[PDB]
Symmetry: C6
């Protein structure tokens, strides 16, 4: 279904943000 | 319900942005 | 309702982006 | 209507992102 | 259509993120 | 339909965010 496809894209977005939070903590450490 | 799944992923997104906001404050304030 | 729950999460998201903009402005003006 | 409310929150999100991009352009340049 | 309006706001969001990606690449590329 | 168009735009947003993550990794590690 299209609603599930929307939820799946939001999941993907959540994980790109996890990567960004990871890197930014690295930057705030260095 | 997939509408509830969508709300849940948006909640997750909010949480990550809050983490990012925290690190940006660190950078701003000298950490 | 579930539609309102989605709107509320998008409000939370706007709120956090507002925080990030604030911090990035302080960084940029420093 | 809650669909409208969702559109409005997306508007707010795009607004905050435009501010963030502004600040990052400043960092980039100066 | 309110669904159309949602898609349009999402398109605006993608646009601003594109801008932020360009600026952050510049910040990194030097 | 518009539900598909919405999933479309979300996909594009995830793409942009992936790019951002990579740039930030460069910054984090110098490049």
């Amino acid at each position: 279904g299209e609603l599930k496809a929307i939820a799946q894209e939001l999941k993907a977005i959540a994980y790109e943000l996890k990567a960004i939070a990871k890197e930014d903590k690295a930057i705030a450490q260095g």
